[PDB]
Design an enzyme around this catalytic site. Structure first.
Site, PDB file in Angstrom:
ATOM      1  N   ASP A 230      17.944 -26.350 -13.435  1.00  0.00           N
ATOM      2  CA  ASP A 230      16.841 -25.510 -13.912  1.00  0.00           C
ATOM      3  C   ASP A 230      16.574 -25.724 -15.403  1.00  0.00           C
ATOM      4  OD1 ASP A 230      16.662 -24.350 -11.312  1.00  0.00           O
ATOM      5  OD2 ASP A 230      18.093 -22.778 -11.876  1.00  0.00           O
TER       6      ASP A 230
ATOM      7  N   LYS B   9      14.866 -26.330 -18.735  1.00  0.00           N
ATOM      8  CA  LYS B   9      13.501 -26.092 -19.214  1.00  0.00           C
ATOM      9  C   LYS B   9      13.565 -25.668 -20.695  1.00  0.00           C
ATOM     10  CE  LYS B   9      13.754 -21.507 -17.090  1.00  0.00           C
ATOM     11  NZ  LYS B   9      15.004 -21.834 -16.351  1.00  0.00           N
TER      12      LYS B   9
ATOM     13  N   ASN C 189      15.682 -22.764 -21.996  1.00  0.00           N
ATOM     14  CA  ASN C 189      17.124 -22.975 -21.988  1.00  0.00           C
ATOM     15  C   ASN C 189      17.652 -23.834 -23.126  1.00  0.00           C
ATOM     16  OD1 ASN C 189      17.825 -21.451 -19.711  1.00  0.00           O
ATOM     17  ND2 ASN C 189      17.179 -23.084 -18.330  1.00  0.00           N
TER      18      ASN C 189
ATOM     19  N   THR D 148       8.868 -22.548 -14.603  1.00  0.00           N
ATOM     20  CA  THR D 148       9.957 -23.266 -13.928  1.00  0.00           C
ATOM     21  C   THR D 148       9.390 -24.446 -13.150  1.00  0.00           C
ATOM     22  OG1 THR D 148       9.868 -21.652 -12.126  1.00  0.00           O
ATOM     23  CG2 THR D 148      11.613 -21.371 -13.756  1.00  0.00           C
TER      24      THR D 148
ATOM     25  N   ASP E  28      22.980 -21.858 -19.623  1.00  0.00           N
ATOM     26  CA  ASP E  28      22.874 -21.681 -18.167  1.00  0.00           C
ATOM     27  C   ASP E  28      23.329 -22.860 -17.316  1.00  0.00           C
ATOM     28  OD1 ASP E  28      22.148 -19.055 -18.420  1.00  0.00           O
ATOM     29  OD2 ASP E  28      20.108 -19.300 -17.605  1.00  0.00           O
TER      30      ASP E  28
END
Ligand SMILES: Nc1nc2ccc(C(=O)c3ccccc3)cc2n1CC1CCNCC1
Length: 445
Positions: free
Chosen positions: A131, A133, A136, A171, A152
């Site tokens: 995930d 992106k 993050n 996302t 994360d």
């Protein structure tokens, strides 16, 4: 077994990341500040057993790399998981970038070498992000030449992502097509980093669309171009690296480690400013943050509807007198009872909040205790609207609303219908109070 609030107390809320809220906390003995992600079990399903989560946790604590969030501790109780990691002060990468006069490939290469370096390290230890992106990628400090810290890593493997749109904004642009279809590995992070690189050098997503499903449709097909006029200013080796990272079949896609050896990283770390790319990112980011703000405002209005009525019933039932008045301790018990709450980590947290509202008649306490949160939520929305309105016109046009609501996944017929009910004559633009009114009507008010 060991309890979380024996060791840590909440300082203040930081934000809402994936899987749960992040709370700035302080160790009650050493005074060390930490960023605690709190995962609500009752809204976030596990993908793995407890055995498997405790093993990854044990490993993550031992890992150490300058571009990866340092994880210190893991707690669990009946209702939540607590991930305690180091706190960073530099903010999200993209918010720092949009506050710059200049931004060249040298800046992009340095950013991406850090990201690839974090990833490489993690993949060597068999941990995938999935995930990845811009949200993050946090800058370690407010200072100039500061490290990017990826947050994360490893979590997506153990928890189920939210299917609520206030958790999904931004996302779709970054997810690797093979993740959509079910068979994926560490190569999905290279893909995601490739999309970030693309956006860094043009300010536009390579896969884009009117709404979430349209975005995913473009990604699944996997086709993009370097047609946009601002690519005329980017080196060929940069485009060449992007091509290898956005290669459709994952076994044919370049690895993290190999991307670090790519000519472009080699050349551009060891030079015109991309003026157009900066203006594009600045527009992208305002749009995303305003859509997020809209959705969170709608959510907080619905939570407020819920919690206002619930507290009233709790305080009614508690008022044995019929007086319409309660004692301090009873307001605390009924407020505690309301929690059956990221900030409200213990009984001591609530007492402060109760005492803030006071600083008598339970119906008045209820208004203020929520009205605070209601006014608090409005102001975040207002700020995002101001930021989006970059020429200070005080308006958002129809085209802009469509982009904004499309990112927010509000059906076009539905918001256009809401617009008509708010202002009849209208003139194709809305001011802030009109925008807010539209959002109220989009959450049944
Ligand atoms: N300032 C800051 N430093 C942080 C470090 C980590 C996190 C996490 O989301 C986190 C924390 C522990 C375990 C896993 C993720 C979150 C952090 N935050 C707060 C973020 C900063 C970006 N805006 C949203 C809130």
């Amino acid at each position: 077994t060991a309890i979380f609030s024996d060791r840590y107390k909440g300082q203040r809320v930081l934000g809402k990341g994936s899987f749960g809220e992040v709370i700035l906390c302080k160790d009650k003995i050493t005074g060390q500040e930490c960023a605690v992600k709190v995962i609500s079990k009752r809204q976030v399903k596990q993908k793995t057993d407890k055995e498997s989560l405790l093993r990854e946790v044990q490993l993550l604590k031992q890992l150490d790399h300058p571009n990866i969030m340092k994880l210190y501790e893991f707690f669990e109780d009946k209702g939540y998981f607590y991930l305690v990691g180091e706190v960073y002060t530099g903010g999200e990468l993209f918010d720092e970038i949009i506050s710059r006069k200049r931004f060249s490939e040298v800046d992009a290469a340095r950013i991406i070498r850090q990201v690839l370096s974090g990833i490489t390290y993690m993949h060597k230890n068999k941990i995938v992000h999935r995930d990845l992106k811009p949200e993050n990628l946090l800058l370690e400090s407010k200072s100039k030449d500061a490290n990017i810290r990826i947050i994360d890593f490893g979590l997506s493997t153990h928890f189920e992502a939210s299917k609520k749109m206030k958790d999904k904004i931004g996302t779709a642009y970054y997810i690797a097509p093979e993740v959509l279809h079910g068979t994926y590995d560490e190569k999905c992070d290279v893909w995601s980093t490739g999309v970030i690189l693309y956006i860094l050098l043009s300010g536009c997503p390579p896969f884009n669309g009117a709404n979430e499903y349209d975005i995913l449709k473009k990604v699944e097909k996997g086709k993009y171009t370097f047609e946009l006029p601002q690519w005329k200013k980017v080196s060929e080796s940069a485009k060449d690296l992007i091509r290898k990272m956005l290669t459709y079949v994952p076994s044919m896609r370049i690895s993290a480690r190999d991307a670090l050896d790519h000519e472009w990283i080699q050349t551009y770390t060891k030079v015109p400013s991309l003026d157009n790319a900066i203006l594009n990112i600045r527009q992208f980011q305002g749009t995303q943050k305003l859509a997020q703000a809209a959705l969170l405002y709608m959510g907080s209005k619905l939570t407020s509807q819920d919690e206002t009525k619930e507290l009233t019933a709790i305080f009614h039932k508690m008022d044995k007198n019929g007086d319409g008045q309660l004692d301090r301790a009873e307001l605390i018990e009924g407020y505690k009872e309301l929690m059956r709450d990221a900030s409200m980590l213990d009984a001591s947290a609530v007492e402060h909040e109760v005492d803030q509202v006071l600083d008598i008649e339970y119906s008045e306490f209820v208004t203020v205790a929520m009205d605070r949160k209601t006014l608090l939520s409005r102001e975040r929305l207002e700020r995002a609207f101001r930021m989006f309105d970059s020429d200070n016109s005080g308006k958002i046009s129809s085209t802009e609303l469509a982009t904004i609501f499309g990112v927010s996944d509000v059906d076009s017929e539905t918001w256009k219908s809401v617009l008509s009910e708010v202002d009849k004559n209208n003139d194709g633009e809305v001011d802030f109070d009109e925008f807010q009114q539209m959002l109220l009507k989009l959450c049944g008010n």
